[PDB]
Nucleic acid binder design. Sequence first.
DNA 1: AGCGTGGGCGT
DNA 2: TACGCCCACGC
Length: 89
Amino acid sequence: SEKPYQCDFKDCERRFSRSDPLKRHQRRHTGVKPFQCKTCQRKFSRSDHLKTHTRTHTGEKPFSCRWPSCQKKFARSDELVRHHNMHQR
DNA sequence: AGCGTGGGCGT
DNA sequence: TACGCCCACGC
Ligand SMILES: [Zn+2]
Ligand SMILES: [Zn+2]
Ligand SMILES: [Zn+2]
């Protein structure tokens, strides 16, 4: 089996290569949200998704456009990616 | 646009 | 086990 770790929840055939993505996954079923924003008290299933959320409060935008003459900055990498693909297109 | 929230992955 | 990235979908 290329993905030995199967989810044993009702009507879920999801499988993974490693054990930790299975645990992360299973927080969908249980609604468990370990991490919490200290600003708006909102809780999140994943710590990385919390840190990006925090930037909605702080206004931090670590991702700059590499295109010349462009000063656009973004909070997440995927936003910069969508922006970069907007230039080349 | 701005961002919630998934999987895949390196370390 | 953990953190922190990329990438992606879908409003
Ligand atoms: Zn499952
Ligand atoms: Zn918040
Ligand atoms: Zn740009």
